[model samples]
Target chain A: NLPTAQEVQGLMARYIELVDVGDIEAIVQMYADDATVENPFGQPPIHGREQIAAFYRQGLGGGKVRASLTGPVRASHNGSGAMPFRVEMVWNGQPSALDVIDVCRFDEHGRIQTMQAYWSEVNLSVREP
Target chain B: NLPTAQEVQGLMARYIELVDVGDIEAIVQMYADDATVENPFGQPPIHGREQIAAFYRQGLGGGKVRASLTGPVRASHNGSGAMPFRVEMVWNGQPSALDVIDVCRFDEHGRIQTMQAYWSEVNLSVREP
Candidate 1:
């Protein structure tokens, strides 16, 4: 059976919390073994659990990243979910903020199977806005 | 005041129709003069109506692109909308498909102020899969 609405919400919440804490390993563990991630959406995807973990490690700057969801996640009966969020970090020692939306499909086990993130250079503010 | 849900739906429908017909000019006119487009969402945005038009012209390949929304649009009271769609086209004389999600913010004049499309290389298929 598909996960209940509450379960899905909890999963998404935990995922966001992991991101906020820069918990790369725990975040990677939330995905299925064959999961894939497409960040910024038009670029090449990073596939498999190992690569996914590596991508997060490099992107998170070793616990320097901080993020938060702007609103509640929207989940479907088919194990799909969407969340809008923002990330705050320092790039090249300059404060930057990114407005983002992530859509994901979960496996029967409630693990993420695929994730797509939407954001652009325009969505990235060099300074907090 | 924000547009009614019905109006946003109509606009989204018209937009899909224009895209299916590869009508770049009409599509460009649907945006404000200073509108911005971020297709695939992480790259630099195409700013202004002129640039947006040019980008579409180049992307559509002179009336060769076809696209359709998979479901009804979701419009919020805050003048924002989202649509999930799939596009089929010929690239280099080979058939290809792309799954996409687009979120848009509309201005008071009912023109699109910003458009962000979510899709990745993984969402694209070179064959008819």
Candidate 2:
């Protein structure tokens, strides 16, 4: 059986909520024990739960990061009971939102197993690189 | 009555195709005679068809621009026979795609009367400004 739409929605909501609240522990807890995280830009990839937790802690420490999506999130079937979604939005009320596209795999038990995001800083800020 | 879904889809398709094919003349044809284009950042607003044509010509001269959307397009009712859409996508396979939203109004005869495009350009070519 596949995860219901409500389940997927619930997970996404939690994902955003954890990030919004800067709850680093809860952020890592949302993922599977072996979850992988890849953020946008030149940052190094964080593999496995420990590294992912560290990255979340650092990102959250820099202060709150808001995630605002303007378009529909198109989800894909993982076939193994995992639900993956892709979305794009303007962050922080900027006219041009940093293109944020991430694929998240959920465990059968409903925890996110992996997250990979791709984006550009130029889209989010007016500063010159 | 609100514009039909098919009509919105058709207009969007033509919007991309016309721009892709570099048919500047045809591009002008799609807009209402008194169209307007509001570009992001420092560019000046172009009001009316003639200025819009010049901008299109200048933009097309730089090379072909391909608009590939990755999510569902949400259309709004203008209440005056207009159709507006908001979409986000990764342009040309780049890691990030600029955010683009547009509103178009149509005349009673079903022809587009005025067009307003809110577009931002970022995340292209990795060039430093």
Candidate 3:
């Protein structure tokens, strides 16, 4: 069954919100047990909540930061959604931001099943501290 | 092999440019012969150049007008990229716009292997022409 655009967009919002607050536990709650996350999309994907949680922990405060929506969240006719945002953080002890687009597929129960974050160092920009 | 972020981002720019010009032939050239497109996502996918061309031909003029990027194109560490944009057009006999994000995966040759457009009628916004 196809998830409504509303369902998908709502999840997308909650996602950014959780990430903004760096709430790894709640973020993990949003994923299914077997969910897969490719934090940079092109590299290897980590499976299940344990690895997902660890990945976010190592990455979020490790460099993450307060995220803000750079554009509207887009919902497909299917059960997926995608959004673009910027993650502000300290990189090499310098203020910087990474532009990102995360494409997500949700399970029937509304938990995220797969997430592919489309971003690379090319999207990173250094800014005034 | 991972396509560099440069290659992915350049193709992303070329994509929106071609779409803005409504060059269906050139747009089709960006895809592999057996490529698949899930425009508006969540619906059934259309495969191959023939169907893909028909899909764009119908949709581009059917409702599409000028298209422009709303945010940066994000390239994953892998062989894919995604970008958010808005499509200005006529919908239901009124000036309207649709917010969209296109997530694409490229083959080793850099031809688009898969393109998933995330959007829906919910994204439609009516405006004065």
Candidate 4:
């Protein structure tokens, strides 16, 4: 069955909120046990929640990550949703910005089964905005 | 000066709605004269209004395309926004689906200056829903 757009919106919101707080546990809890993630599409996917959490933890580092939704979340009835975001964080003590688009499929248990982030080095900028 | 989330939402709604009708002319009008589009990231960008229109025309292929928003439309103070979508269409009379995330930068005139679609062959499926 397709999840409602509102539910997907809430899920996307929680994702950014958790990332902002740098809470690895809470962030990983949103994923299914066997969830897979592929950031930038062409790379190999990171499988399982354990690895997914590890990836986010390393990405988050010891600093706060700020994220803002760039467009309305669009959801399909088949338990999938997608959204775009701008993420700001400190990289090498300099402010860095990222433009990201994540497409996700959710498991029956309301956890992410697959997450694909579409971004590349070209999409990153070193700026204060 | 950032466009409000509401404006971005309206723009996205028009995008899908217009594409659903296969109105390539109107769709092209939404872009700046020198707008650029890079679909699926790794590909070379289709530059200018003429090329962009041609690209969409070929993609639409004299058929109707349906699109829906999957998450809340988030806009930043800057002239940029991003959204995810699920697009359904007919290919060889078989129902085909695409999972896409689009990140856009708008011109001062509120037209799209640069638009990038995040999707790949892996994200396409041949299924009827």
In terms of lDDT, which candidate is strongest?
3
Which sections of candidate 3 miss by over 4 Å? A1-3, A62-64, B1-3, B62-64
Q: Judged by DockQ relative to the true structure, which candidate is superior, 1 or 4? A: 4
Clashing pairs in 1: none
What's the DockQ for every one of the candidates? Answer: 0.04, 0.02, 0.80, 0.08
Lowest lDDT 10-residue stretch of candidate 2 chain A = A79-88
For every candidate in turn, the CA RMSD to the true structure comes to: 14.5, 18.4, 1.8, 11.4
Model 3 agreement with the true structure over A1-129: per-residue lDDT tens digits: 546788888888899999999999999999999999988886788998999999988888656488988877888766788988888888878889999999899988889999988898989999964
Tally clashes: model 3.
4
| Candidate 1 total steric clashes | 0
- Report interface Cα RMSD per prediction: 11.9, 17.6, 1.2, 10.8
Q: lDDT tens digits, residues A67-128, model 2? A: 54434333333311111222233335433333344445577777777665534332243323
DockQ of model 3 vs. true complex: 0.80
Q: What are the per-residue Cα lDDT tens digits for candidate 1 across B1-129? A: 565555666787788899899887889899999999977565578899888988888888754678997655655445666666779988667888776767787888889998877655545679854
TM-score winner among the candidates? 3
Report the interface RMSD that candidate 4 achieves against the true structure, in angstroms.
10.8
- Supply candidate 4's per-residue lDDT for A110: 78
- State in Å the error of residue A120, model 3: 0.2
Q: Model 3 captures what fraction of native contacts?
A: 0.88
Worst 10 residues of 3 chain A by lDDT: A56-65
- Model 4, which residues run further than 4 Å from truth? A1-129
Alpha-carbon deviation at B95 in model 1, angstroms: 46
Could you tell me the lDDT of residue A103 within candidate 1? 73
